[PDB]
């Protein structure tokens, strides 16, 4: 795997692959939920949970019924599945532009 300062390959905003450098490692927590319509999201922010205060009191229990504010502003019902501590990599390209990406998007 990857440490900081390392030179890696990742996709640029322009769509092409370039060598870029790894400047920061962050561990970022994403929530996963199963919506009532049979769909799921595993990349929710904790504060997208509106039926409890997760920044302050942590994640709902696994399998708990929650209400989720989605990206159209509207609230949907769901069940909590998991919180994911995910390795993030802030990468810098030759032109000074930075992205924040996860492991499957960075290449050794």
């Amino acid at each position: 795997s990857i440490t900081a300062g390392q030179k890696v390959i990742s996709k640029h905003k322009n769509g092409r692959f370039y060598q870029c450098e790894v400047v920061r490692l962050t561990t970022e927590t994403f929530y996963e939920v199963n919506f009532d319509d049979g769909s799921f999201s595993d990349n929710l922010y904790p504060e997208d949970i509106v039926s409890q205060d997760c920044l302050q009191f942590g994640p709902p229990a696994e399998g708990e019924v929650v209400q989720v504010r989605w990206t159209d502003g509207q609230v949907y019902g769901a069940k909590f599945v998991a919180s994911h501590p995910i390795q993030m990599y802030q990468v810098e390209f030759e032109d000074g532009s930075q992205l924040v990406v996860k492991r499957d998007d960075v290449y050794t």
Partner: peptide, 9 residues
Amino acid sequence: QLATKAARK
């Protein structure tokens, strides 16, 4: 990026 959804199974 914003959260996204998809069908499972």
